[PDB]
Amino acid sequence: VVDPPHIIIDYGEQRTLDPEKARGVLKCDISDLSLICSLGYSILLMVTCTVYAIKTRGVPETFNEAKPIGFTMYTTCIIWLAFIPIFFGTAQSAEKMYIQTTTLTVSMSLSASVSLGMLYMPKVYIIIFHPEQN
Amino acid sequence: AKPIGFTMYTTCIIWLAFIPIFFGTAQSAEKMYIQTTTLTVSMSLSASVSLGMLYMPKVYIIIFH
Amino acid sequence: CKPGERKKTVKGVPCCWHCERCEGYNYQVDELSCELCPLDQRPNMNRTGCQLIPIIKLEWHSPWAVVPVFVAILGIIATTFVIVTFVRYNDTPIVRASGRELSYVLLTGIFLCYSITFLMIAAPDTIICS
Numbered sequence A: 001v002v003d004p005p006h007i008i009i010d011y012g013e014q015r016t017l018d019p020e021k022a023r024g025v026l027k028c029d030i031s032d033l034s035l036i037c038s039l040g041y042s043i044l045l046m047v048t049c050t051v052y053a054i055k056t057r058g059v060p061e062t063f064n065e066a067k068p069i070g071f072t073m074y075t076t077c078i079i080w081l082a083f084i085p086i087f088f089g090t091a092q093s094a095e096k097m098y099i100q101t102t103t104l105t106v107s108m109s110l111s112a113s114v115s116l117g118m119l120y121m122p123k124v125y126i127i128i129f130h131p132e133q134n
Numbered sequence B: 001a002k003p004i005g006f007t008m009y010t011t012c013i014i015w016l017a018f019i020p021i022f023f024g025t026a027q028s029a030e031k032m033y034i035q036t037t038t039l040t041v042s043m044s045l046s047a048s049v050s051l052g053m054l055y056m057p058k059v060y061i062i063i064f065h
Numbered sequence C: 001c002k003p004g005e006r007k008k009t010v011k012g013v014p015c016c017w018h019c020e021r022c023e024g025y026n027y028q029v030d031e032l033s034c035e036l037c038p039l040d041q042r043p044n045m046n047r048t049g050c051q052l053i054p055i056i057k058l059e060w061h062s063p064w065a066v067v068p069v070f071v072a073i074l075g076i077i078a079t080t081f082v083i084v085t086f087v088r089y090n091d092t093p094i095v096r097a098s099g100r101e102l103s104y105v106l107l108t109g110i111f112l113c114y115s116i117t118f119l120m121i122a123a124p125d126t127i128i129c130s
């Protein structure tokens, strides 16, 4: 509502002394503060879920799936704690946009892979390969 | 098995984070400072992760229990 | 004076002016002074005009995009396999003990992560940022 999305052609912002080297860059707003603001709520959910996992270690094993949850949360927190310095360190660079895009996509793929694998793959393996104990 | 897996995972994350911060920099006067600090902190972090995940629990049990 | 050279006249003698080539980001339309091309475009080779600065984006065939796209395809295939496996064996005790509904929500989250990798790679044409 506040501001509809629009594209920006940075015809400048990379002006060099050689007129041949001049290049415009096609982008769409999406400044760094926007990325941080859009990811903040999910990161807060992450942190509180990890807090509850820390607070719930130790179970009569009737409540299974707590132990895999702990590993998933620790792994994901490590991923994003590593992500932050890369975003704040390549801010002034000649190829900032490529690195930031690749970093964000790789981080999200890694998080999804960790959750999917470590919470579902044993079950699939048992279901197909060992139907006797399903 | 679990400490070794955790150690590998954390070290791999550290070095995959090291590569873009190190090889892409503001190409300015403070480039040597940034590169040196990044390298040294990465190496120390890897060493500390190995030490913590392989030896600290055993020392804790030996001394305090 | 040749094209791209600027004329300056010695006082007292209308003849034998001086020529001057101006600078990189200037073009000479007055034949006595050289103007400046705006930020959008760039001085022409002849030094009396302007040419548009080329625009660059992120392209699908670049090395920056081949790796995330590969990972996204592999992950999407794996998640689809898992979802279908759950769908066929919906009444089995393991799936019933997995917490079915919230498991489906989590699977949707994983699928969305891979899809957003695709979106971020794709292109800047207004609706994509939406």
Ligand SMILES: O=C(Nc1ccc(Oc2ccc(Cl)cn2)c(Cl)c1)c1ccccn1
Pocket (backbone or CB within 6 Å): A079, A082, A083, A098, A099, A102, A103, A104, A106, A107, B013, B014, B016, B017, B019, B020, B021, B023, B024
């Ligand atoms: O994105 C990550 N890691 C990464 C690794 C290599 C990369 O490749 C390049 C290529 C050239 C230059 Cl100058 C710089 N980096 C790039 Cl962009 C990124 C990452 C790593 C750990 C956790 C989360 N995310």
